[model samples]
Target chain A: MYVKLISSDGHEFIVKREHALTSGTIKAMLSGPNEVNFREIPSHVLSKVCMYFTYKVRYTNSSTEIPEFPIAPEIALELLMAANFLDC
Target chain B: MDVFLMIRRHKTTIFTDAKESSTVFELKRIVEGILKRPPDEQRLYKDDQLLDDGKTLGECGFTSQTARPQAPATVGLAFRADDTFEALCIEPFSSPPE
Candidate 1:
């Protein structure tokens, strides 16, 4: 199954449902048989978030050295805000 | 309205001051700038009470008692990114048995 996440700036990401559940916020949002409403995450921020979800999934139990999660200085603040919101 | 702000994080205690009408949200911004951490990671407290962002320092009891008699009112800050709230969760005060 797939989920549709919409950014505040109108960008849309069609992602796998399982992969999206990597975030506690998204998991809670989609839990308990609620309607699959669009996520109000912003574009650039959500873009980075999506990448993080994929990274977390791929490295959940791997022995490979995990790569550094480099976030831009300007966006780092916002990313922390966004990540806090998403609970990822 | 002047207040003495105390941020209690781990073992460090930072002191600062601001107006009584100042909001926790504004304080978070100042701390975020210095720590490079976001507002969501802060939990502001007043005395033994936890504080919310929308409420002004005065509303949190920072002004009524210390309006102009003593030194600046004291407020506490606990920085931790352990939850989803926009600002850090100010844990409720747990007093020792009396």
Candidate 2:
């Protein structure tokens, strides 16, 4: 199963349902429809968040050393805010 | 092993998981569920090279051994428009003002 996330700029990201559920906000949103549009989140910021969702799912219970999720310096603050809002 | 796929169609990207042993046709069938396009009307490419329907993901160099942990394997998607597979054209962006 997959969930469709739409950014403010209209970029669509089809991510795995399990990956999307990593965010509490998204989990709540998906209780009704599988698609959610974050009108306040820009495409660049939303894209990185989706990547983090996947990263979190992959390394959550692994024994190997987890690699740092790459984030550009310019978007650090914005990404942090988005993560907080999503409760990921 | 499960292979993560980033199937790009123009500006939209569909992310899904598939087994390395799955055939290309099987992948298209998955896409059909999302895009509502029949498997025969869809085209998938890796590095611009068209993949044969009968070939498995492992045969297409997307096995667990070759999978990238940090990023999903990118595959370009196109649908049949009219008589042929739609061309994936990339127009060059104009240079920013000096």
Candidate 3:
């Protein structure tokens, strides 16, 4: 399964379908052909949501006990899209 | 690329302002402004801590560990609210800036 994901900053990525499985979020959205999209204009290198995505990925992988990434949901959504795109 | 601090006062003044509205909502409003998104759009937090209406920020020990006064407000960490639960629709939309 291949999917194309567009980052909030217009960075487009292409990859397999299981990249979502590598991350906990895709596994949780176990319902549809969930084309989850993260959309935030990363201000910094990430457009405007750089720090946000940093916090989101860090907070998610950390022991903060939260199940979701911490950042602008749209930006986070773009990240999810990136995941789907990169899932090989 | 733009970088800014989140203290109550300007760059010259850090601890000079009296607590406005006597609440930690400042933290939320500022974040929303920078992102230009609704406060209820996602979860807003300091670092790992959250401010509650029932206790002083100090009393709640916003940090996961020891209390540190010098740290920026570590209120929110992640988002749990969806579009339906966002605060913009029910009450008056808030953008209480300092």
The C-alpha TM-scores of every prediction are 0.43, 0.82, 0.25
| Cα misplacement distance, residue A7 of candidate 1 (Å) | 0.6
Question: What are the Cα lDDT values of the candidates?
Answer: 0.60, 0.78, 0.34
Lowest lDDT 10-mer window, candidate 3 chain A?
A41-50
Model 1 over residues A47-81: C-alpha lDDT tens digits?
Answer: 56766665576557989666666666766766788
| Residues A5-85 of candidate 3: C-alpha lDDT, one tens digit per residue | 344444432223443344455445443453444463221212222223223433455664653324444445544544454
Give all candidate RMSDs, comma-separated.
Answer: 18.9, 3.8, 16.8
Off by over 4 Å in 2: B63-66, B89-98
Q: Which candidate do you rate higher for lDDT, 1 or 2?
A: 2
Residue B12, candidate 1: alpha-carbon lDDT: 31
| Model 1, C-alpha of A74: deviation from truth (Å) | 1.4
Per-residue lDDT value at A5 in model 1 = 64
- Evaluate chain B of model 1: give its TM-score: 0.65
DockQ of each: 0.01, 0.35, 0.02
Per-residue lDDT for B1-74 in model 3, tens only? 11122222111111111132333454445544433445454443334334554343334443323321112232
Deviation in Å, model 1, residue B12 alpha carbon: 47
Q: Which stretches of candidate 3 lie over 4 Å from their true place?
A: A1-88, B1-21, B45-50, B53-56, B62-73, B79-98
lDDT of 2 by residue, B1-98 (tens): 88877778765777776899999999999998998899989888898899999999989988754554446787888888548878864222112111
TM-score of chain B taken alone, candidate 3: 0.35
Poorest lDDT segment (10 consecutive residues) of candidate 2 chain A: A46-55
